[PDB]
Scaffold this active site. Structure first.
Site, PDB file in Angstrom:
ATOM      1  N   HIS B 428       0.797  -1.251   0.000  1.00  0.00           N
ATOM      2  CA  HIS B 428       0.000   0.000   0.000  1.00  0.00           C
ATOM      3  C   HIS B 428       0.824   1.294   0.000  1.00  0.00           C
ATOM      4  O   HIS B 428       0.734   2.108   0.937  1.00  0.00           O
ATOM      5  CB  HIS B 428      -1.040   0.016   1.135  1.00  0.00           C
ATOM      6  CG  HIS B 428      -2.216  -0.887   0.894  1.00  0.00           C
ATOM      7  ND1 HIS B 428      -3.074  -0.725  -0.173  1.00  0.00           N
ATOM      8  CD2 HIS B 428      -2.648  -1.987   1.555  1.00  0.00           C
ATOM      9  CE1 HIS B 428      -4.004  -1.665  -0.141  1.00  0.00           C
ATOM     10  NE2 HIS B 428      -3.777  -2.432   0.909  1.00  0.00           N
ATOM     11  N   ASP B 469      -5.648   5.304  -1.061  1.00  0.00           N
ATOM     12  CA  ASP B 469      -4.880   4.644   0.008  1.00  0.00           C
ATOM     13  C   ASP B 469      -3.896   5.612   0.689  1.00  0.00           C
ATOM     14  O   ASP B 469      -2.765   5.228   1.002  1.00  0.00           O
ATOM     15  CB  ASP B 469      -4.073   3.446  -0.531  1.00  0.00           C
ATOM     16  CG  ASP B 469      -4.947   2.241  -0.893  1.00  0.00           C
ATOM     17  OD1 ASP B 469      -5.874   1.880  -0.110  1.00  0.00           O
ATOM     18  OD2 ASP B 469      -4.670   1.614  -1.952  1.00  0.00           O
TER      19      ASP B 469
HETATM   20 MG   LIG Z   1      -8.182   0.727  -0.136  1.00  0.00          MG
HETATM   21 ZN   LIG Z   2      -5.882   0.334  -3.556  1.00  0.00          ZN
END
Ligand SMILES: [Mg+2]
Ligand SMILES: [Zn+2]
Ligand SMILES: [Mg+2]
Ligand SMILES: [Zn+2]
EC number: 3.1.4.17
Lengths: 643, 661
Positions: B428, B469
């Site tokens: 992420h 994110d």
């Molecule tokens: Mg997400």
């Molecule tokens: Zn994502």
């Protein structure tokens, strides 16, 4: 002769007019005689001694005052105070004369008016076209002199008083207009209009347009919007050069007076142009200093007016967003006035045992809760100690309440019973001795908010609910409390010096992120040495672990209650801890663990806390033993478990 | 009469002075003569014809103009324009003149100066103590008359001029203050001093104090410039207490001659008089009060220092009102960013960083790579410093910078802030975000999204791809085993708690200075452009995807209305989801390299710290089979150019099947 001194005294007898103009007529008309001049007039030398002015020629009082630079051949008279004649001519003074005049110039007698006071040519007395035998004498000059020697004082003073009457008038004017442009800092659009109206009457223009520099271009929207290059045309020049510009003929056009705006520095920030003079050939070179005068108030007002829009615009977008974090929370006026019915009530009237560690906050009614909060902070002397507007505070409390959602455990009712504990600790352990007042405030404000907008969490550990996350959720709750403080009339930290206010934010940010069991575990070894080595009230570090500690202790404060009470709450903790999610996208034999899970929690998390609390606060021992006890009840409920 | 008409002409010859006082001297010293009067003086009738004034007695121009009410015995002269004598005066009157001139009074000739223009007694010509042989004649009064008849006009005009010059700079005075005050409407602290400094010079007080009405009490902050780091002493007196309280309460000025003589009035000072006046706003609500203590060069406060106070008091009210009005905003704003700053861990894109990125060349996509736009592109392939540009180049090519007139210095700042805004987990990270945005970008090209959605949507979509994110950490947690876990728990859902976090983070940026790329959208656009992002980013919740999935079908079954507002929501949700898991469409060794990151994250850390890889195939197979695939089948069930994607997932699905064996 005594005979001139007859006609003169006769004159001054007559010069009793209040108008410098009407006085000029009498004086002129008498000379028009005694000099056999066809027409006579005075060119008044300017205050700055740099321009000639004539408002009265012959027996005609000019509609508009004629003026022109104090030249050379007409400008040398002023200097050597010597009287001249036509044969002493430039073709200019002869052009600008017979033009201002209106005819054939065969003769001309210029006799300077020298003051016995200031002692300087103040006026240029002119005689033209000698009636007949075109012969202006060295005595034709004498009669003129003689006339002013008596007549000049008064002439000049009636004229001057008339200048100060005007000067005094273009201020009350401006005083007015200043006070009209400043009553519209609200609306750059209305203000921009005012500037136009006012600018048009002040100068008396047919029309005014106003341009506001928009980077590299002029925008006189003045209703549509009109862009254009900042350096193009009249506006562009004036804007570029930062200096006024006067136009006699522009070639229903005609003239144009255009002026800059500039800010605190001298940064032209806008530009305005007036077109065509009403009752006039152009713009009085006085209509310039007056325009410049005005133009200061335009720059002052536009500058702030825009600078205020920028905020209101921004600040608006700021909340459009913040109401987004609110699930648009409804705290109606009726709502708050209803709760806030002049009686905050005292804690004492809430209940006897309302303040003893044996109290059960969950025992109260839920509509009698937000009151208790007011009476809890009240009694902790926080409303007056900090001058909390109640209408604001009661709005905060109702908003924070409406901000809790509805899981079994993580609901407003948990936030109240958690705060009420904080409150208990305050009284019972007398926290005023260990922490500053601003801390005990933030600690409590945190209890009230630590689980905001919670929706419920769920071979496992309980300290994964009643606990930790990735701090992600603790950061949420903090973030939600902020949205509330950022809601109108909810910010109870209104008057704190920026100093306090910041620290009031950090405090709350730390404490709430302190409600992460994963965080507690991390500092736990620090929470011991402090327990081991006293607890410095001077130690800034020790304050931090105390505040963490207290928070944690309030948060699981249900461990210290009666067996039947903890029993009832554990139901809610576990009802929650065991359900729902994204699992939804497709327990009794697993509620058998409720004991070990519980036992393990207490032994490993909960007790090591109440141990510490009583290792710093001996008044806090009753809580430990309560936890250590309940532990044993749980121990029994575990015997019924298989092996 | 030619003889006086000799002396008079001779007088006007002399009356060429510029000071009305020096003119009065010559007139007076001529009359001191011609009437054999010991002394002479003129008493000038007040404009309001209610007061006599005298600034010249005999040949002495008085250091302080004397004055007094236009009485009855001296006031009947003004009325019937009849000249009088001492024997027509009351002892009361008489004692005044003696006392005013300082001598005996045996005689006195008062001749009214009547204006040849206005035709009104303008002055009172006074002749005193007839130079021996005390006898003021019926012709002594004539020489007086005669004199004025010529001399009076000029006298009167020089006087007049001087009063206008005095009035004009008493206006200009106000202008300077008005301007001095109106240029401090930011901090009501500076302006509030000005009001003091200014008001104290205006009336000429020994001291001035300003108080602002704070509800039901008067407030007054301490200063001169001690330092308001942590404020600086605040005085509060009940709003209705003492002088200020009364004046605040009654909203009307208050003048005091002697303050001790007051019901309402000691450590050195000893105060004489007090002028206190109200402030009030646009309506007439007293907003503040100000008192001036002790008059300098004076007994008290001229009943002209009042109208002056009122006049000024207007500008005070104007500025104070707006000044405070602005503080209120600016506060609400600092108090926001101070918080906003914090939900950001104090991110700072430098004036250098941005200019370095923004070097007049946004570069076009074309020069990035040959088929940087073809479905086979691996965003992850590019350099980390070269990504932010690409963004700039992708928004460029989709025609967003100009179409919406995005300031680039703002836009480039935004992009570098949403980047510095990501954190560092295995999967992420900003890199996942760029590749995810890129996939959006691609979709726009390859499927030509301009035909299905409105340009603002394709704009919110992209912008969401950029932040979905933000500030992420590594998801994973405890694992109900690690074989008893589902990938649609990472690359997916939360409680929406986190998706709400990324949306909110992205708001803190837009709320940061010069980053609000949505600066100039109509309040209408700006709103919708926020819901859009809110919805889309919350759509990046796998649990929400499944929730609308059945609605993603009937749409796919029944066309896809471009008129359906409802179809645009689903379509935008689908698109987001698709860009999120877009790495399932990439090449086997591409996806294989990715899954590592996903799986390295998905397995670690937490509170486990405080308090099974063999499944990476079934785990992943099960993902594609249950989640990922049904998506790209829908993407190609609405967009047939989106078929290359389906098959690329179905295929990758197959390699995974083999690694399973
Ligand atoms: Mg997400
Ligand atoms: Zn994502
Ligand atoms: Mg919690
Ligand atoms: Zn809690």
């Amino acid at each position: 002769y005594t005979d001139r001194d007859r006609k003169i005294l006769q004159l001054c007898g007559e010069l009793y007019d209040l108008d410098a103009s009407s006085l000029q007529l009498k004086v002129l008309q008498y000379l028009q005689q005694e000099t056999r001049a066809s027409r006579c007039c005075l060119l008044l030398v300017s205050e700055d001694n740099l321009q000639l002015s004539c408002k009265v020629i012959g027996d005609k009082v000019l509609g508009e005052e004629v003026s022109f630079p104090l030249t050379g051949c007409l400008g040398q008279v002023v200097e050597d105070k010597k009287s001249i004649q036509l044969k002493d001519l430039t073709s200019e003074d002869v052009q600008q004369l017979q033009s201002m005049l209106g005819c054939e110039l065969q003769a001309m007698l210029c006799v300077p008016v020298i003051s016995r006071a200031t002692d300087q040519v103040v006026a240029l007395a002119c005689a033209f076209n000698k009636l007949e035998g075109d012969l202006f004498t060295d005595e034709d000059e004498h009669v003129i002199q003689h006339c002013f020697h008596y007549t000049s004082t008064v002439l000049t003073s009636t004229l001057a008083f008339q200048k100060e009457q005007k000067l005094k008038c273009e201020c009350q004017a401006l005083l007015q207009v200043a006070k009209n442009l400043f009553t519209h800092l609200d609306d750059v659009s209305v203000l921009l209009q005012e500037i136009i109206t006012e600018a048009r009457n002040l100068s008396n223009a047919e029309i005014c347009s106003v341009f506001l520099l928009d980077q590299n271009e002029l925008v006189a929207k003045v209703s549509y919007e009109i862009r254009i290059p900042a350096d193009q045309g009249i506006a562009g020049h004036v804007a570029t050069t930062g200096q006024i510009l006067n136009i006699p003929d522009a070639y229903r056009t005609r003239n144009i007076l255009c002026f800059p705006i500039k800010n605190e520095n001298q940064e032209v920030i806008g530009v305005a142009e007036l077109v065509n003079k009403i009752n006039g050939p152009w713009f009085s070179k006085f209509d310039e200093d007056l325009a410049t005068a005005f133009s200061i108030y335009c720059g002052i007002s536009i500058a702030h007016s825009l600078l205020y829009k920028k905020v209101n615009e921004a600040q608006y977008r700021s909340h459009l967003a913040n109401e987004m974090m609110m699930y648009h929370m409804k705290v109606s006026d009726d709502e708050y006035t209803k709760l806030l019915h002049d009686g905050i009530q005292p804690v004492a009237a809430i209940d006897s045992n309302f303040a003893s560690f044996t109290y059960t906050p969950r025992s109260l009614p839920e509509d009698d809760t937000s009151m208790a909060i007011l009476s809890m902070l009240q009694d902790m002397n926080f409303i007056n100690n900090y001058k909390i507007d109640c209408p604001t505070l009661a709005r905060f409390c109702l908003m924070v309440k409406k901000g809790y959602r509805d899981p079994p455990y993580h609901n407003w009712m948990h936030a109240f019973s958690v705060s009420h504990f904080c409150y208990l600790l305050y009284k019972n352990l007398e926290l005023t001795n260990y922490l500053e007042d601003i801390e005990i405030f933030a600690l409590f404000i945190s209890c009230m908010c630590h689980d905001l907008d919670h929706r419920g969490t769920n071979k496992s550990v309980l300290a994964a609910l009643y606990s930790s996350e990735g701090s992600v959720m603790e950061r949420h709750h903090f973030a939600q409390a902020i949205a509330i403080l950022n809601t109108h009339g909810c910010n109870i930290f209104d008057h704190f010096s920026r100093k306090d206010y910041q620290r009031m934010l950090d405090l709350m940010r730390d404490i709430i992120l302190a409600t992460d069991l994963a965080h507690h575990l991390r500092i736990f070894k620090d929470l011991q040495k402090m327990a081991e080595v006293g607890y410095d009230r001077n130690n800034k570090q020790h304050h931090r672990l105390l505040l963490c500690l207290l928070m944690t202790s309030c948060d699981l404060s249900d461990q210290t209650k009666g067996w039947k009470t903890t029993r009832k709450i554990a139901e809610l903790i576990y009802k929650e801890f065991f359900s729902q999610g994204d699992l939804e996208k497709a327990m009794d034999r697993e509620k058998a663990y409720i004991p070990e899970l519980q036992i393990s929690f207490m032994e490993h998390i909960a007790m090591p806390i109440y141990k510490l609390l009583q290792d710093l606060f001996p008044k806090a021992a009753e809580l430990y033993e309560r936890v250590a006890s309940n532990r044993e009840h749980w121990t029994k409920v575990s015997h019924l478990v298989p092996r």
